[PDB]
Amino acid sequence: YVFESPKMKEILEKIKKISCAECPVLITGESGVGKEVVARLIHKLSDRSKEPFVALNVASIPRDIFEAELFGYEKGAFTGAVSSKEGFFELADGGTLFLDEIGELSLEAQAKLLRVIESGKFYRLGGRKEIEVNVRILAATNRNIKELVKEGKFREDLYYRLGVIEIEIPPLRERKEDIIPLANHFLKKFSRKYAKEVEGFTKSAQELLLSYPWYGNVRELKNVIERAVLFSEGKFIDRGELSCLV
Template sequence: MKTQVLLVGGHETIVLLAEELTRKGLEIINTRDYEKIFQLISKETPSVAVCEISVESPPFRQILDTIKRASPHTAVIFLAEEARVEEAVSAVKLGAYDFRLLSTDLEVLVKLILTALRESPKHPVEEGFITRDPELLELLERLRPVARSRAPILITGESGTGKEVLARWFHRVSDRSRGPFIAINCAALPEALLESELFGYEKGAFSGALTRKKGKFELADGGTLLLDEVTEMPLPLQAKLLRVLQEGEVDRLGGAYPVKVDVRVIATTNRDIEAEVASGRFREDLYFRLNVIPVKLPPLRERKGDIRLLAEHFLSEFARRYGKNVQGFVPGVLEILESYTFPGNVRELKNLIERAVLLARNNLITLEDLLWEGDSKGNRAPRETATPLEIKPLKEIERELIFKALEACGGNRTRAAELLGISVRTLRNKLQAYKAQGLL
């Protein structure tokens, strides 16, 4: 992926900038049509936009507003034939990165653009939360001041939308960023174990409690505690959680006195929490206490512009992790992904790209690498369309997939097991069985 710069205008300086920036390895998007700016920005999200201002162009305020509405994080540089100092100052105050004359030395302009690129993220990456969706970016900007408060946050949204990633964003942009970020999945532990994990216990509190143990609240002191899938918490524990939020102190199991804690709580759920309250499965008072700052994270199908951005990000991440020379996608693949609904949201996309990187035989990912079972419009083909001749015994299919995974991973069993979603031990046992059968 190359860093993109949008150049708007037809002046000789714009042409020369395009040539010079291209030589430096940047991807240039060039247009003379000011009416296409919003469309181009929404689709590509360049890091920097350099716009010519002339008697034939719209006013700089209109151009700046158009770009910022489409991509708030794109740095905007204006180049004018003539300009008053007041006009340049006004542009910068309104959000422009800089305002220069078209007659400015080319080398100076190139350095200015490169500096803007260094200071502006290649994509809108909000300290780990990746998006180019205008509404979501606007929401993050509104939430940034709130992140510095101690008020509890409740993040709702479908499974796989990135609720924990958003919770970590809140922590990173808060004044607690130097403190710990502790997460616990309330659905993963039985009630007794969840209670001890949250609140801790004293030595001798129960059979097996040989030493004192601090709970997650104490471990998160001075930082942030994420209560993932909080609606799965049993009702008795909900009452204890409410007291901690109200009093700012925890009672260890078997403890003689409460322990003060300074913790910012963020809770997440993929359920309709109001329906859970109405049914009596979640305490209403706890809901109101957690819902001080409500945040609803939209599913990936409602922010289509993020699919390409995330796919490219995950490709770079996994190519680096697995040491694969995979640099992009063959033409048409990203368009098919953008037309798919992704019921599993970002998590599904991430798993899809990870598998494709591992299976890729060339430096560009194909539909075959994605194991795509669908048409060119992003519609998944139903498995029932397979003919009887294509049906194989499950054991044979399993064996073929294991061999393909090992081949794709260069024989690395750990990576192959990750790709297959099984443990290394299970993979080793399967291979030993194949060897005993003379199939390996």
């Protein structure tokens, strides 16, 4: 990974300092800024470096089977319970659990989440033995959680538990010092990956990168660079190729 902006350097120093503590960590920012990158950096420098890093997104979780993913189930608990399954809390036993897009969780299921965090013990669906696990919680959000709380769309206890230490990542629109390093890194990486000689962007094309108000941020930048490399026919990338996408 590449970090050059002063804000990114400050965030890196903060991540270095907070890796020792085991308190839950919340990260917020716009889409495609690198929240998962920061979470993985925290996990790597933490005392649980060799432990599993279980990352999951709650947006793709169906409403009516959330418990089956929260606790897991044993064999034959219900129709379709072919074999035993482990919930994400049991998967990350000793490791770190990373919940992405926590702000879109339904109100009813939220009350069912922190209840397992504070107690620390749960029963598998169809299981008659009690399971005790220890997990470090990292959470990611895209919107403002405080405004959601003021609208009654979020639990304040869950915010207090998750918001022990919270981090804000500046979007790429205000990190213009990373545009050229990220573009060059992606260019070299994808040029090696697809095995075709592309040296670097022309001077004319460089100003287009700054002039572009990136809305998809790093994800959009990476996709654009990869597509430009795929269609590239020379070692120098001109502004004409980039202008087709933007």
